[PDB]
């Protein structure tokens, strides 16, 4: 599956030729290199290891350094992922942004924004109690279980706790524009993560 | 159609069979078809 490690620059909008506005998210692609390969007869499966923006030479541990010993003029890469079942490339290669030039839809994977310790009403769209008529119940859970059967709280009952921070992959984002000279992709819609967080863009499954 | 507990022939042309462990009636008069509950 064709994929790339990009950085979510932000959002904007563009004007189609006839006047229709399209809200887009912009992704900037630092150069991506193929660092190694995984093979079915040696690792158990076939995949390509892909890496991106470099690290500072004072903060590369020697295991990471030795990972790149045999590669020529490829500094250590901070973001490393795997692309399963891909061919047409080998160690030392380098993937342009134009691999999406023939693609209509993409999928983007990133780390969603963190919202801290969040309550039930924000986390699960719980309604609350009334704010008047004598109520002493505003944004609490309400009841949680049943009385004596089962005499416990079922596993998975939704309560308060931390919200967001998980990975998430959003599907079928239309591809609006590709700009090779500035290494940018413009997709239509929202992309998980805060500004400057790093996403992975894959060719759409459908 | 007539998922019943007593399945009996209705006309002389109805016939009794047993299929995969249930008792059934089959006939030309499809209105007579039956299976035990």
């Amino acid at each position: 599956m064709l994929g790339l490690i990009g950085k979510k620059v932000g959002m904007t909008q563009i004007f189609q030729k006839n006047g229709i506005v399209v809200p887009v998210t912009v992704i900037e692609f630092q150069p991506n290199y193929i660092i190694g390969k995984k093979t079915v007869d040696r690792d158990g499966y076939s995949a390509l290891i892909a890496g991106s923006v470099d690290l500072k030479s004072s903060k590369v541990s020697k295991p990471i350094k030795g990972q790149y010993k045999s590669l020529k003029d490829i500094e250590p890469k901070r973001y490393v992922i795997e692309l399963k079942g891909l061919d047409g490339y080998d160690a030392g290669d380098e993937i342009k942004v134009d691999v999406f030039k023939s693609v209509k839809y993409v999928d983007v994977t990133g780390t969603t924004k963190g919202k801290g310790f969040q309550g039930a009403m924000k986390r699960h769209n719980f309604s609350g109690g009334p704010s008047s008529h004598g109520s002493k119940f505003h944004r609490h859970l309400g009841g949680t279980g049943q009385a004596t059967t089962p005499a416990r709280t079922f596993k998975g009952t939704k309560m308060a706790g931390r919200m967001a921070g998980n990975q998430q992959t959003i599907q079928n984002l239309e591809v609006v524009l590709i700009d090779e000279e500035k290494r940018a992709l413009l997709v239509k819609g929202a992309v998980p993560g805060a500004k400057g967080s790093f996403v992975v863009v894959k060719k759409s499954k459908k | 159609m007539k998922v019943r507990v007593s399945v009996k022939p209705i006309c002389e042309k109805c016939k009794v069979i047993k299929r995969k462990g249930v008792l059934r009636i089959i006939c030309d008069n499809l209105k007579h078809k039956q299976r035990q509950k």
Partner: protein, 122 residues
């Protein structure tokens, strides 16, 4: 964003002057109607001795809303009062003339005859 209990100006010459929304059609929990939707109204005030009496229930189409709704080209049109037009059984305007402007989403919702009888389409 017309919901239930909203007051509306009847913008045609049937006789009614104020209508009240009592249902938003086409959807189970549907809560808001926009320009070009059909609602069920009761008449709360009418011109005396007209063909429309106070307290009758009809279907009406929304022609002006006070909350702006996005269009494809990015433009938003926000009127200054909420207004509707009464319809007969065929989902066609019961009246013969329409007062004031209407919004052009009627065009897309296929109310061409309301659009034509309007004075200005914005």
């Amino acid at each position: 964003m017309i919901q239930m209990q909203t007051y509306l100006t009847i913008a045609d010459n049937t006789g009614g002057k104020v209508a009240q929304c009592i249902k938003v059609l086409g959807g189970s929990k549907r809560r808001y109607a926009k320009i070009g939707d059909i609602i069920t109204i009761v008449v709360k005030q009418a011109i005396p001795n007209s063909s429309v009496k106070k307290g009758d229930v009809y279907k009406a189409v929304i022609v002006r809303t006070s909350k702006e709704v996005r269009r494809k080209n990015g433009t938003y049109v926000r009127f200054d009062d909420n207004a509707c037009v009464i319809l007969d059984a065929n989902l066609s305007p019961r009246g013969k003339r329409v007062f004031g402007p209407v919004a052009r989403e009627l065009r897309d919702a296929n109310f061409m005859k309301v659009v034509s009888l309007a004075s200005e389409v914005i």
